Nucleic acid binder design. Structure first.
Lengths: 93, 119, 50, 272, 195, 158
RNA sequence: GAAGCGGCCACACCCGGCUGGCAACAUCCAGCUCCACUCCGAACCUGGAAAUUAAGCAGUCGCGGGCCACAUCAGUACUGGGCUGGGCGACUUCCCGGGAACGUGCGGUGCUUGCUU
RNA sequence: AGCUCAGUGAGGACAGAAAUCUCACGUUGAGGAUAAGGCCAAAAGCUCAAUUUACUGUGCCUUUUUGUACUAGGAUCAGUUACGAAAGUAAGGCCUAACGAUCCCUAAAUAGCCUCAGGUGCGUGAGGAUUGGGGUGACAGACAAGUUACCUCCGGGACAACUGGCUUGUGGCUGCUAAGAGAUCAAAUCAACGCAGCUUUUUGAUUCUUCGAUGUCGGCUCUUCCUAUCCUAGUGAUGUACAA
RNA sequence: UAGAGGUACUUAUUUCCAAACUUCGAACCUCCUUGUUAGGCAUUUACCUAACUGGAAAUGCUUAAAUGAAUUAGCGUUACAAGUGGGCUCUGACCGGUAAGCGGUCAUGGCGAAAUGGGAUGAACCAUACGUCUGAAUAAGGUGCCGAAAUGUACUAUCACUGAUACCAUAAAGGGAGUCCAUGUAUAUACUAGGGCCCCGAAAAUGAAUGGCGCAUAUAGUACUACCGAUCUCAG
């Protein structure tokens, strides 16, 4: 599906509608200073294989596209979620 | 009557004459007082229960049945259910109606012929 | 292996051993109802006692 | 010869439209959203200014909906305007505005609120104005239309009609169109403005008459307080009775007489 | 080939016609339901002669075509395609089914493919007619005696009072014709309702 | 293949009678409701916003909330063992004023008409009440048409 | 009687005849501004008033189509209880209760809420 | 806001069964993303124009409480925008499917709200509360290939192979009817297309009995029973001359 | 399905149909109401209305008149815990199957956990659901003898190596100057509309079972009394 690159939207902090440059959301790669990760590093050391599971039987090939409505008055992003999409385009017209 | 239409296979019933309504209450009549199933014995039983409703003695109670006066259901509730023995002719067919050569359901006037021999 | 899936033979029997009528406490349900109505219904009660 | 549409199977199946959809006078999608009021306001009236323009007459009303039927609270009608000044052109644009002033000022003098709400209104510790909605109808809502001429009369009269918006108003645009026929064509001036010449008001007078029309409407708005209404309604039947009576119904006896005389020609009498 | 028709006599389901849903259906054995002088009249062939069924059951399509051929070939032999008019007043719409069987998976996914067409009769349903003249009323009864042995159960052969295949008695027919209320279509009688 | 959908097994529930298709009349929107009022839920099949469930078709309840387009209705569904209360919200175009009480309210006002007017003359009152249909008084009957019904001889007529 | 506004939404619809226009509704006449035709003043819009009831509209007629109503259809079809009733069966007498439809016959073809001349 | 579709009927240079144009009838049979069923005509369809309410925040209700959740939908309140002359309408798609826990990671704050236990500490860094995403289709959600005739154990007639039982489609046997074969002639003898039965000597179907075991195919040897009779006893028919 | 009328279609018809067709539409069901109902008065509100001596809602006061279907019945609420989570089945309705003592559902009943009597015999069918005893009169079902009780009275059919009491323990299509009863016509007689009972159709393996003996007015129907008979009913 296509989507506008700018549209009007309620800025939650400014408390009114205002036009905002939208963009696709950043999937961050995990840092190793994370507490959860640290537990994993220490626990993975020693013997007795891999410890926690990873999901082998993973069927579905789809992903809910979260957008990032970065405001221009407020300067603050507020994340909108669409449904689940196979492809995602920008509108050119 | 519409209640009796549902239960017609389970019961025999009809319209008793005054000599039959009499003879039940003098012989077999009992008063259900405070859930006790007491035998009728003497008229001071039924003065105490029913005197405020202007029914003094057993003649006035029997009258209140067969004329169906205003305090009928007081007088009927006062009477405990009668308990009869199985009659000295027998009778033909439980499971057919009287109308089709049997027993159950409405027999109008000839209930008096049945109750004589049940008593 | 293949045993029965369901039955309703003696559902009726069990229900009638006891169909108890659950009675409502009050007809108003103040979690629901219009807030704008109930907002004013407070200021009716609050003003009266003074 | 192809399929006969309109069998018995068609007409048995056929649902009708209501009535004023068939006669083609009301949009019921308008009307159902014109009438409606929130259930938290319960039995409350809201008024609606009807303003339907026939040929000759500009009609204008104020209406409340009820379950039995609609009820006019006050009415005004452009054939009244001869009394106030305006003799001719009773579906002009300035005639439509003049009825708008009558519907306002009569309605406010019935309610006894004439000293309040003198001018247009344009906000607290002050009495709130009458909400009166525009019912247009099936007339198309374009700019410079004669429906919104009646609106501007009602707003300048008194009533808060909600909207988002003095030429055309004191007889302009009529008066210019007189001059274009008068100056050039001359023949066409006799066709177009026959009655005007007859009075004859002239091109110049249109501006003058309307201002003193708006003076006299604001001074003495209500009129023709007739009673009782029953004996008024009886007189109108005699006054406007066709000289020739309408054909009246043949009775069931004389129908069967005429049926049989037709059936005598083709044989097999009589019966029905 | 076929099952014995004692399999598919009595009716142990809802009726199951040829449609979108049934799909893979073979067409019935019957094509012609009606033979003899089809283009005739009510007045030309007044005498009528019916075969009534005295059971509530299924009649096969194979029975109804056996009954037509045995009817025609007797009436052809005697009088010779002139007077008579044969008609069949069952149409087989009910479709039968089979579980097949013919290793094996029996009684699992038991629903089965359609095998053949059938007609569902009702107690006193006429399943045949012969309309004819008074000369060959004798021959019509002897035809329907032979056609009755084709059908399941037992079945009465009856001389009707009413004219043709019309629902009018001989007494009523003269009164309406005389009245002029009734009219004649190419075949059969069309009433005049005076409307 | 039994399904537990919202609008399931409602082919003929939300059908629109016959020659009663289209939107309803605007008299329906002009009607008013109050808290405590008895109302019956029967559905317009056309108007899709703010329906009830399939189950509360033909189901009497009492109004408890009222809101700009819609009415909160309290209705007693029978669960398994017990009769639960159910707080519905539903639009006014699926909701009508029920005539359950109009027998009762007619009698109370008819009684007060009798109880007052007895005292106005006064005089002395007979007490009216409802009573099931009762066995008849004796009376005498002369007819002057008496047919004699008999069974005819059977004839086939086909 | 006519008109604007409506209520139940065919006893009001659909085909085809006949009789009416004092005002009113309408056809109609004209195109300059308001604005209107993805072309056209046909429509929509605006300004008229010469002549007409031909059409719409109103009333009315038709062994009219449909719709509505009552009576027959019929104690039929089907159906809730009951029988150590019948019947190889399929189905079905009878007893105590409820009770259609299509068709046909005759009738009818809008009844008036609030304002106005 | 304006308009009416599918289709049928007549027309119209080249024009044909189908191009574009015109009038007339046209209750909706077209179309409304898709399954099937509802729903819809000055619309919910088609066209044109302007738009971002497919928006933000907490409770509530229904499906469903004999089991409370998520999904989906619904009525509001508190905001704010869009559009319209306005009443109003909009919280996606006319209505019913189109999707998902803890833990962990991750993103949202112009860079905010709390904590880092001697400091009402100073940078970095980390951890929290609140709101989405990354995913489990076995869809209330372990992270997971075979073989055993070398096999073991627990139990199961809750479940098969095996005799019996019920059933008779299939197999076998027999009626009723005749449409003709049979030179001629339906019935000496065959017998269609049909219809109605019987049988448990075939094989199915089923799972009632037996899994703390009724020794399972055939042949050999001996007994008795049934007749739906091939021969022997006695009888009738014949396309029975004799015989066969 | 099969003709007629119009210019293969089409206007009316006709034979005969639909679990996933509906222009009509039952029975059986289902849900709500049936004692407090009409008002009047004046405080409260930031809500609604153009406006308040209005609306909406809850707080109190009070003006009138009564307990306003039947039959029955005390009703309400909480805590703790057992066993259970293989069911089977009569009579009707139903899906799949040729059908099954087959598989899967529905409504009331039954068994499981329910004796006793009756169906010779049987979990389930009929009567009836039970303390220990003594009687009376009954129910289902029976009354030649086994076996308690009429080979009862009144009235019609039946000859067959045959018939004989619900569930039930099998028999059909199709035949018969057997006998009894019988419909319509024609001339004592010919031609048949049929109905019962009886016969044929009707063949399996140990010797064999209306329960047996046996019966032939102890077989098949019909009506009315008397009588025997349960742990039911009634009396002590």
């Amino acid at each position: 599906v296509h989507h506008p690159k700018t549209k009007k939207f309620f800025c939650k902090f400014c408390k009114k509608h205002t036009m905002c440059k939208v963009s696709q959301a950043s999937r961050g790669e995990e840092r190793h200073s994370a507490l959860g990760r640290r537990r994993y590093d220490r626990k993975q050391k020693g013997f007795g294989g891999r410890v926690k599971p990873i999901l082998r039987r993973s069927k579905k090939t789809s992903k809910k596209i979260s957008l990032r409505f970065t405001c221009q008055s407020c300067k603050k992003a507020t994340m909108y979620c669409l449904g689940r999409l196979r492809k995602f385009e920008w509108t050119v017209e | 009557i519409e209640m009796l239409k549902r239960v017609t296979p389970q019961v025999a019933f009809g319209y008793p004459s005054v000599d039959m309504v009499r003879k039940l209450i003098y012989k077999l009549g009992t008063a259900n007082l405070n859930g006790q199933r007491i035998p009728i014995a003497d008229n001071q039983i039924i003065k105490v229960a029913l005197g405020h409703l202007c029914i003094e003695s057993v003649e006035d109670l029997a009258h209140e049945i067969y004329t169906v006066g205003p305090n009928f259901a007081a007088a009927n509730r006062f009477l405990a259910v009668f308990k009869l023995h199985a009659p000295k002719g027998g009778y033909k067919k439980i499971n057919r109606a009287y109308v089709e050569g049997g027993d159950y359901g409405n027999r109008e006037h000839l209930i008096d012929e049945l109750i004589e021999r049940m008593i | 292996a293949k045993r029965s899936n369901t039955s309703a033979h003696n559902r009726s029997h069990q229900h009638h051993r006891n169909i108890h009528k659950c009675v409502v406490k009050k007809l108003w349900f103040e979690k629901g109802m219009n807030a704008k109505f109930l907002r004013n219904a407070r200021y009716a009660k609050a003003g009266q006692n003074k | 010869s192809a399929k006969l549409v309109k069998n018995a199977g068609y007409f048995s199946r056929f649902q009708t439209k209501f009535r004023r959809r068939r006669e083609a006078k009301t949009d019921y999608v308008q009307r159902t959203q014109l009438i409606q009021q929130d259930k938290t306001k319960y039995g409350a009236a809201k008024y609606r200014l009807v303003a339907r323009i026939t040929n000759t007459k500009v009609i204008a009303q104020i209406v409340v909906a009820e379950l039995t039927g609609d009820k006019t609270v006050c009415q005004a009608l452009s054939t009244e305007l001869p009394k106030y000044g305006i003799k001719l052109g009773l579906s002009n644009y300035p005639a439509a505005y003049a009825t708008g002033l009558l519907v306002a000022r009569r309605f406010l003098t019935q309610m006894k609120l004439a000293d309040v709400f003198k001018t247009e209104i344009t906000d607290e510790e002050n009495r709130r104005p009458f909400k009166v909605i525009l019912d247009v109808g099936l007339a198309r809502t374009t700019t410079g239309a004669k429906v919104f001429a009646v609106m501007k009369g009602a707003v300048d009269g008194g009533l808060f009609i909600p909207h988002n918006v003095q030429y055309y108003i004191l007889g302009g645009a009529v008066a210019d169109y007189m001059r274009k026929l008068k100056k050039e064509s001359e023949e066409k001036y006799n066709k177009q403005f026959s009655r005007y010449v007859k009075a004859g008001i002239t091109a110049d007078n249109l501006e003058k008459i309307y201002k003193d029309a708006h003076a006299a409407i604001r001074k003495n708005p209500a009129a023709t307080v007739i009673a009782d209404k029953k004996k008024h309604a009886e007189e109108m039947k005699q006054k406007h009775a066709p000289k020739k009576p309408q054909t009246k119904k043949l009775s069931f006896e004389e129908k069967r007489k005429i049926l049989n005389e037709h059936l005598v020609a083709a044989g097999l009498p009589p019966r029905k | 080939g076929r099952r014995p028709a004692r399999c598919y006599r009595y009716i142990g389901n809802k009726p199951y016609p040829k449609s979108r849903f049934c799909r893979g259906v073979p067409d019935p054995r019957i094509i012609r339901y009606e033979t003899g002088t089809k283009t005739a009249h009510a007045k030309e062939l007044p005498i009528c002669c019916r075969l009534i069924l005295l059971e509530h059951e299924c009649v096969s399509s194979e029975a109804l075509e056996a009954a037509r051929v045995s009817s025609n070939r007797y009436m052809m032999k005697t009088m010779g395609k002139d007077g008579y008019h044969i008609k069949i007043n069952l149409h087989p719409f009910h479709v039968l089914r089979i579980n097949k069987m013919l290793l094996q998976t029996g009684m699992r996914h038991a629903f089965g493919k359609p095998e053949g067409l059938v007609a569902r009769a009702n107690y006193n349903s006429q399943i045949m007619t012969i309309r004819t003249t008074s000369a060959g009323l004798k021959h019509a009864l002897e035809a329907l005696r032979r056609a009755s042995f084709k059908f399941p159960g037992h079945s009465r052969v009856v001389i009707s009072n009413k004219v043709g295949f019309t629902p009018y008695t001989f007494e009523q027919f003269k009164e309406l014709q005389a009245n002029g209320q009734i009219v004649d279509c190419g075949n059969h009688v069309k009433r005049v309702y005076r409307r | 293949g039994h399904t537990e959908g919202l609008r399931h097994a409602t082919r003929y529930l939300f059908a629109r009678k016959f020659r009663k298709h289209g939107a309803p009349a605007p008299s329906i929107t002009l009607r008013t409701f109050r808290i405590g009022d008895i109302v019956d839920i029967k559905v317009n099949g056309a108007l899709h916003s703010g329906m009830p469930n399939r189950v509360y078709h033909g189901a009497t309840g009492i109004v408890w909330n009222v809101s700009p387009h819609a009415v909160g209705i309290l209705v007693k569904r029978r669960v398994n063992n017990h009769i639960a209360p159910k707080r519905i919200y539903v639009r006014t175009e699926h909701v009508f004023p029920s005539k359950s009480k109009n027998d009762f309210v007619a009698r109370c006002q008819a009684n007060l008409k009798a109880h007052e007017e007895a005292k106005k003359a006064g005089t002395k009152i007979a007490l009216p009440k409802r009573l099931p249909a009762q066995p008849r008084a004796s009376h005498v009957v002369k007819p002057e048409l008496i047919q004699t019904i008999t069974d005819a001889p059977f004839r086939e007529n086909w």
